[PDB]
Structure formats: C-alpha cells, structure tokens
Amino acid sequence: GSSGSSGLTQQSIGAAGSQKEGPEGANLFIYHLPQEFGDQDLLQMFMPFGNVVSAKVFIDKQTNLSKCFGFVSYDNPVSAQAAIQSMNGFQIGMKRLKVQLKRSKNDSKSGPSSG
RNA sequence: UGUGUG
C-alpha cells in the first residue's frame, strides 16, 4: 500500500494508532476536541498542512471515550507551525479548538529548598 | 476530564 500520488493533499494511514513524539518544533497539542474523535479523524483533519509521522486523540482506557485533547507529529516544524496558524480557533460541533506546540522537559531546578 | 496512557 501507498499514498497513490506525490501530488495528493493526503497520505497513507501510517500515523493513526501510534504515539511517536515528533522532533523539536514539529510536535503539536490540540484541545477542545469531540469525545467521539479518533486518531484517524485527527490525522485526516491535519493532513492538508504537511506529512504526519504520528497522530493521536487521548482516549480514556476505562470507557474508550476522548478526553477532548490530542496530538500531531510532523516530520518538520514548518508544517506544524502552518497547522497552528490554520487550526487554532477552528470551530467544530459548537466549540473552538485550541492548538499550539506540545509540552516537554527542557529545563532543571534546585534539589534542597532550605539551604 | 490541560499535554501521546491502553
């Protein structure tokens, strides 16, 4: 299987059901999603902005429902930035999506607080 | 029910 053409606005479904975190500036955090939204829905939503390595809606392991937040990993930071610029404020159902770069460790702090 | 778990 393959994406059928290099001129297409879409790609192969090699990114849904995964969890791989994208490189620096290429990983996204999405918030205010529907509770029935899946990993393939978030992929097909973000497909137009570049090539996606991994796409995931955070699903509750107890009930199989979405927690209204998700993630998208591009192969480069310009496609991720273009998706922030296109999807931050996107109206869906009856509410607007919030979109930005993902949170991650990039800092350190002191051990003892008393001396 | 604010940051890729199952």
Side-chain angles (χ1 to χ4, degrees):
Chain A
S2 64
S3 306
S5 179
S6 298
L8 190 63
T9 52
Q10 296 189 310
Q11 64 162 81
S12 298
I13 314 301
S18 193
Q19 71 204 103
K20 186 178 297 293
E21 308 185 80
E24 188 178 271
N27 52 64
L28 297 186
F29 171 65
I30 300 78
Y31 202 97
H32 303 296
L33 294 168
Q35 291 203 267
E36 60 270 82
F37 221 68
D39 288 7
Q40 191 182 107
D41 300 290
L42 194 66
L43 181 61
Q44 289 176 2
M45 182 77 132
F46 279 71
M47 266 182 187
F49 314 118
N51 64 321
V52 177
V53 175
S54 180
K56 180 167 228 66
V57 183
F58 195 91
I59 310 308
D60 200 310
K61 69 181 70 182
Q62 303 165 108
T63 59
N64 302 303
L65 300 178
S66 159
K67 306 306 308 186
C68 299
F69 73 87
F71 308 97
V72 179
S73 300
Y74 289 90
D75 189 59
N76 79 82
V78 183
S79 299
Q81 282 293 347
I84 297 171
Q85 289 283 34
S86 299
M87 301 304 296
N88 192 56
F90 186 98
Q91 190 178 313
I92 195 178
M94 201 57 67
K95 57 180 179 174
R96 286 186 291 124
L97 298 183
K98 180 172 64 179
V99 189
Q100 58 161 86
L101 298 176
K102 201 185 74 78
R103 190 175 299 283
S104 50
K105 181 175 171 64
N106 192 35
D107 74 286
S108 62
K109 297 293 169 293
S110 305
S113 56
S114 57

